[PDB]
């Protein structure tokens, strides 16, 4: 047993006990306050609590690193990524393209870049599950009509041809077993659905992923994002130069403020303050474990007026942003190579940040969070979403398991017993989540701490010939 | 790295995050409430918080046991106590008593049994530090004219005679080096003070103790308590029979309610409810990790009227108590063997409980807590004191180290910067502790979470010839 592990475990324990002592005492006083005295005392209470909570979180961070846990988690996440990229690379590069089984994906989904890239991700995972080489058709891509290879490497070096002695539209892995070339539709219309879909992870990796990562579902998705966005030389250089021209250095927190056409249809308008309270909380947390010279935000937004508002409102922050990129994102110019490369850079710099604050309703932020998983052993928690939890559009049902019983106080709450399967719809970031107790057929609110994530697995191929 | 260790670390981490989400939302609601609606919602808040907090503490319990940590902690705590008892036993049993260096302690200190027992402990620790065999003089012991051996085994099998070619009163380890027999006074008057005093622990054991135990100072004291209280046969049998006749079985929580002459000069009167809120909270905590058939309290008190009050007020509790022992403890009849036997048994059963609720101002409770440390790997945290933190009367200055800065909000508070040495006077069990900032000469309140205990060491002998 390690001395620092044991000291830290006890300090976390004691810090939580003193937090409970503190709460009881202060809440008892609050009960006897009125008017402004109550609001003064409640605000001072919350200030004191935040620092206290962060001390506990900081000690838990240190506990994650003791006794070589940091070096090990890093080495094991490296091996898991090398192994999956090895297998993906093997599947995508057969010797004989003319005889290879293939899956054809068309990039041209009626949506934006994040949605299109996630369509390709979904095609790829199904290609990997069916041992079919992914063929990406990208001519007339609305963002770059020359296609994918305008920015990214081709998804194969040996097999980009879709020819085959037999071709058909997806009808299921069993029916298609002797169809050499299968055309896959968008997940929104896929029938029948195979099991090679999020949020499940490969059976053969599940136990190693749980040791390392707090949301293996995202890690698994992130491996296909990693392979897809391998840059062309010139895109690599453009990112290196942008990194230099902008002052992009750590520590930095990425903020994605999505507006324009999203507002009303798929998400709400969120004022800048809703993002920056979390940014400030997380610089306060970082400052407890490292020197913070200056507070840097990398701001990606499709509102080109925001940067001036943010700078004015938060003068102690250094905002790193390319406002011309933000202009490029207006619908007058969104579907152009100029705008495409802008969102690719914005996503890259969000992904590279130390923490991410955004709306997960936006595919852009999700892509950045997915990529972030490839830059750390476990970045599963390095985010705040103002609205949705992580999801992958088209995923199978995201179920939780109740670990503690719940008795509803209001009719907006659902009851739970341990073992009950809970279909989560969201976390409200207030202590409560929303979902359906599938056992009871009842939908409503439940305390987020009383459930556990249900990791789902699938028997994927293991590509042993890749070793 | 262990799957269960990592899952638990993340669930602790996430449980604390949801606790902070929960606090913010509910406090913001409370700010806008008045009157009874405020008190209803604040009481419901505190109920909700208690279960949430207990979930976090329960997960922290499980993390302490993962990956064989429990088996390891137990083996190492067993080895440490076998080693120290081996050394103490060696020191106490020289082959040649006539030539042995000796330290003479007189039990008849002007106080009660726990105080007299700690006087013997304090003599013993200095005896162990000076390589002198402890000679205990106990004739005319107020509790027993037969002496120590009325209840306990003699502290030596070979050397109980106090003879020597040279005898003197303590004058310091160096001056007394050629004095064969040194008479030690009470700690209240010991001058000059040697280093072999609480709360310091031996140099040679500290790194192992910090790995195993959350308060090494108490563990060290407990090793001498362990040796002293080896019972005579009749007392050993009395303890076994009382165990059966009282129905003493686990789970059980010990409660010591000290009144009579303690009240006013050395401690306050505390109503039974002040003890039982903690008793109930800790049965609620136990219930999260084991089935609790019946809630047993072992009640030790010198108030013979309390047991009937407790049973009436807490009818779902099973109170295990010996009211005739409590009657025997009255001031009028306190100092006789039957009463000595009573407090030895009461202390024994408090020590054997799963948790201890009492006033650490009472020497009776401190003995029980000390003995408890010998029955578990790390029972340093198995207690609630309504007043004092652990202390050993006569101890050297109990210092803490400030780890996080504090800016005082009121004139009741002291400032702290990291590294400041804090002489603690108490924990108020409300989030705040009381002490002196030695750097500044400032006395007052500080958040308890902003300090760390300062473990003190002393170069004691290691008695290698004992192996
Ligand atoms: C057209 O273009 C589209 C992009 O513009 C493109 O992408 C699609 O875009 C839509 C709109 O953004 C997006 O829909 C969202 O999907 C979220 C995921 O829903 C999943 O997973 C959640 C858990 O997170 C479950 O609760 C859902 O039921 C659903 O699971 C389904 O499960 C079944 C089995 O039970 C499976 O068979 C299905 O496969 C599976 N579906 C999917 C899609 O995987 C969902 O959370 C979003 O709902 C929220 O936003 C709505 C507004 O857009 C609100 O009306 C709704 O109430 C939700 O509000 C949230 O409520 C929470 C709880 O109170 C709060 O905490 C949140 O803050 C709050 N959020 C907001 C924003 O208010 C929403 O439905 C698709 O996922 C996405 N699809 C893909 C593939 O990318 C389309 O594909 C394009 N179509 C074409 C034909 O080209
Ligand atoms: C006569 O019989 C006695 C039997 O009762 C016998 O034993 C003595 O008994 C007394 C009374 O019970 C007992 O006094 C208590 O000692 C506590 C320990 O004091 C230590 O440690 C604390 C930290 O825990 C320090 O803050 C202290 O300053 C002191 O440290 C001293 O440090 C110096 C160097 O700095 C050393 O050189 C000294 O050796 C060292 N002193 C000692 C004694 O070791 C102490 O905490 C107790 O104080 C509290 O209770 C008092 C009432 O008894 C209150 O007046 C006082 O304000 C304290 O209140 C506490 O305040 C906290 C903060 O606000 C709260 O959290 C607490 O809830 C609150 N408690 C209560 C109960 O209200 C008290 O002084 C002796 O320790 C004990 N001595 C021995 C050796 O057993 C005598 O020896 C007999 N005499 C003779 C001649 O035979
Ligand atoms: N450069 C840049 N473009 C953006 C930003 N936000 C939105 N866009 C553009 O608007 C599109 C939104 O479509 P999509 O990626 O599917 O994300 P979603 O609509 O937010 O769910 C993006 O792909 C970009 O083309 C941003 O912060 N920076
Ligand atoms: N049997 C028994 N005796 C007690 C109890 N509380 C106090 N006494 C008696 O009162 C004495 C108190 O003296 P002491 O041990 O120095 O403890 P303190 O006064 O509480 O600090 C004890 O030794 C007992 O003789 C109790 O709960 N049970
Ligand atoms: Mn946060
Ligand atoms: Mn407690």
Curated annotation (Swiss-Prot), chains A, B:
Residues 395-456 form the SH3 domain. The chain holds residues 108 to 574 of 575 of the full protein. It is a single-pass type II membrane protein. Disulfide bonds join 97-159, 105-123, 111-115, 358-365. GO terms for biological process: fibroblast migration; GDP-L-fucose metabolic process; in utero embryonic development; integrin-mediated signaling pathway; L-fucose catabolic process; N-glycan fucosylation; N-glycan processing; oligosaccharide biosynthetic process. Pathway: Protein modification; protein glycosylation. A motif (SH3-binding) lies at residues 192-198. It is found in: Golgi apparatus, Golgi stack membrane. Its EC number is 2.4.1.68. Changing residue 275 to A: Loss of enzyme activity. Residues 99-386 form the GT23 domain. This is Alpha-(1,6)-fucosyltransferase. Tyrosine phosphorylated by PKDCC/VLK. The modification Phosphoserine is found at residue 171. Changing residue 362 to A: Loss of enzyme activity. It comes from Homo sapiens. It is linked to Congenital disorder of glycosylation with defective fucosylation 1: A form of congenital disorder of glycosylation, a genetically heterogeneous group of multisystem disorders caused by a defect in glycoprotein biosynthesis and characterized by under-glycosylated serum glycoproteins. Congenital disorders of glycosylation result in a wide variety of clinical features, such as defects in the nervous system development, psychomotor retardation, dysmorphic features, hypotonia, coagulation disorders, and immunodeficiency. One of its GO terms (cellular component) is membrane. Keywords: Congenital disorder of glycosylation, Disease variant, Disulfide bond, Glycosyltransferase, Golgi apparatus, Membrane, Phosphoprotein, SH3 domain, SH3-binding, Signal-anchor, Transferase, Transmembrane, Transmembrane helix. Catalyzes the addition of fucose in alpha 1-6 linkage to the first GlcNAc residue, next to the peptide chains in N-glycans. Its main location: Golgi.
């Amino acid at each position: 047993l390690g001395k620092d592990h044991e000291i830290l475990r006890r300090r976390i324990e004691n810090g939580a006990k003193e937090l409970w002592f503190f709460l009881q005492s202060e809440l008892k006083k609050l009960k006897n306050l009125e008017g402004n005295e109550l609001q003064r005392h409640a605000d001072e209470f919350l200030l004191d609590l935040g620092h206290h909570e962060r001390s506990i979180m900081t000690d838990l961070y240190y506990l994650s690193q003791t006794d070589g846990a940091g070096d090990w988690r890093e080495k094991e996440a490296k091996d898991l990524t090398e192994l999956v990229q090895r297998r993906i690379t093997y599947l995508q590069n057969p010797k004989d393209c003319s005889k290879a089984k293939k899956l054809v994906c068309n990039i041209n989904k009626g949506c934006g870049y994040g949605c299109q890239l996630h369509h390709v991700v979904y095609c790829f995972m199904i290609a990997y599950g069916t041992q079919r080489t992914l063929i990406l058709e990208s001519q007339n891509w609305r963002y770059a009509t020359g296609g994918w290879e305008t920015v990214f490497r081709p998804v194969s070096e040996t097999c980009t041809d879709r020819s085959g002695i037999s071709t058909g539209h997806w009808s299921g892995e069993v029916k298609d077993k002797n169809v050499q070339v299968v055309e896959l539709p968008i997940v929104d219309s896929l029938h029948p659905r195979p099991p090679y879909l999020p949020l499940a992870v490969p059976e053969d990796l599940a136990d190693r992923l749980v040791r390392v990562h707090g949301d293996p579902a995202v890690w698994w998705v992130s491996q296909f994002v990693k392979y897809l966005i391998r840059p062309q030389p010139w895109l690599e250089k453009e990112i290196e130069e942008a990194t230099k021209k902008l002052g992009f250095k750590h520590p930095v927190i990425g903020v994605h403020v999505r507006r324009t056409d999203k507002v009303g249809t798929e998400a709400a308008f969120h004022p800048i303050e809703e993002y920056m309270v979390h940014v400030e909380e997380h610089f306060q947390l970082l400052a407890r474990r490292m020197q913070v010279d200056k507070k840097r935000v990398y701001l990606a937004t499709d509102d080109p007026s925001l940067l001036k508002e943010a700078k004015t409102k938060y003068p102690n922050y250094e905002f790193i942003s390319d406002n011309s990129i933000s202009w490029s994102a207006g619908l007058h110019n969104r579907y152009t190579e100029n705008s495409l490369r802008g969102v690719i850079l914005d996503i890259h710099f969000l992904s590279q940040a130390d923490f991410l604050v955004c709306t997960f309703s936006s595919q852009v932020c999700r892509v950045a969070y997915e990529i972030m998983q490839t830059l750390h052993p476990d970045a599963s928690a390095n985010f705040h979403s103002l609205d949705d939890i992580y999801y992958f559009g088209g995923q199978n049902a995201h179920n939780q398991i109740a670990i503690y019983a719940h008795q509803p106080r209001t009719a907006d709450e659902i009851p739970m017993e341990p073992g009950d399967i809970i279909g989560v719809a969201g976390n409200h970031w207030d202590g409560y989540s929303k979902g359906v107790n599938r056992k009871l057929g009842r939908t409503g609110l439940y305390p987020s701490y009383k459930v556990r994530e249900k990791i789902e697995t699938v028997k994927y191929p293991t590509y042993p010939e890749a070793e």
